[PDB]
Design an enzyme around this catalytic site. Structure first.
Site, PDB file in Angstrom:
ATOM      1  N   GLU A  11       0.672  -1.246   0.114  1.00 47.89           N
ATOM      2  CA  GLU A  11      -0.050  -0.046  -0.110  1.00 47.89           C
ATOM      3  C   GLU A  11       0.824   1.300  -0.051  1.00 47.89           C
ATOM      4  O   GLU A  11       0.348   2.268  -0.381  1.00 47.89           O
ATOM      5  CB  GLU A  11      -0.761  -0.050   1.291  1.00 47.89           C
ATOM      6  CG  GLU A  11      -2.053  -1.169   1.120  1.00 47.89           C
ATOM      7  CD  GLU A  11      -3.158  -0.975   0.010  1.00 47.89           C
ATOM      8  OE1 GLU A  11      -3.119   0.302  -0.517  1.00 47.89           O
ATOM      9  OE2 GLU A  11      -3.934  -1.689  -0.190  1.00 47.89           O
ATOM     10  N   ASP A  20      -6.043   6.339  -5.217  1.00 47.66           N
ATOM     11  CA  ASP A  20      -5.335   5.104  -5.296  1.00 47.66           C
ATOM     12  C   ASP A  20      -5.491   4.587  -6.864  1.00 47.66           C
ATOM     13  O   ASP A  20      -5.611   5.427  -7.673  1.00 47.66           O
ATOM     14  CB  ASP A  20      -6.096   4.111  -4.444  1.00 47.66           C
ATOM     15  CG  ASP A  20      -7.662   3.977  -4.661  1.00 47.66           C
ATOM     16  OD1 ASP A  20      -8.133   4.572  -5.806  1.00 47.66           O
ATOM     17  OD2 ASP A  20      -8.356   3.368  -4.018  1.00 47.66           O
TER      18      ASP A  20
END
Ligand SMILES: *SCC1=C(CS*)C(C)(C)N(O)C1(C)C
Ligand SMILES: [Cl-]
Ligand SMILES: [Cl-]
Length: 164
Positions: A11, A20
């Site tokens: 991440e 994202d």
């Protein structure tokens, strides 16, 4: 290696609001804020999450706090999902981390959609499961990460995260 270090690798860590892989406002270690296209909406979610007026920026400590909550919530959610819990319970600790990783990324409903693969994992048909897992939007859109998670399911080792 463990689930925290694994997800930290997958991440990343960013202390300002960013988009994202799907275009959604996120912060910290993969903390999704909202699917809204409004940056102001994302900032409001962020302030609510942290408990202060952040103006889109947080500290590393605050990032790690949301991350701990998010991992905790992912796990507790798996244990409350009737489709996921039996598969999770059947796995060793390394493969359990792989399943948490998927839930972290796509949510319980998303992972529940992998029923064909989940059945193979429960049966411990690791190579077959790995083949089936790659037949997914998930694998096509995030192939490097999916490959790491799939290797983890296939081998029950941390080999895909070793040099990272
Ligand atoms: S995801 C489909 C299901 C599986 C995997 S074969 C199991 C955990 C056995 N389960 O209860 C179902 C029917 C939801
Ligand atoms: Cl939150
Ligand atoms: Cl990827």
């Amino acid at each position: 290696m463990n689930i925290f270090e694994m997800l930290r690798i997958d991440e990343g860590l960013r202390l300002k609001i960013y988009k994202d892989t799907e275009g959604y406002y996120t912060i910290g270690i993969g903390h999704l804020l909202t699917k809204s296209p409004s940056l102001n909406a994302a900032k409001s979610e962020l302030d609510k999450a942290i408990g202060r007026n952040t103006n889109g920026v947080i500290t590393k400590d605050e990032a790690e706090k949301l991350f701990n909550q998010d991992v905790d919530a992912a796990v507790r959610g798996i244990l409350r999902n009737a489709k996921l819990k039996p598969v999770y319970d059947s796995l060793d600790a390394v493969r359990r981390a792989a399943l948490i990783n998927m839930v972290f990324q796509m949510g319980e409903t998303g992972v529940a959609g992998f029923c064909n693969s989940l059945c193979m994992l429960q049966q411990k048909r690791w190579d077959e499961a790995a083949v089936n897992l790659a037949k997914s939007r998930w694998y096509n859109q995030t192939p490097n990460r999916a490959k790491r998670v799939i290797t983890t399911f296939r081998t029950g080792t941390w080999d895909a995260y070793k040099n990272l």
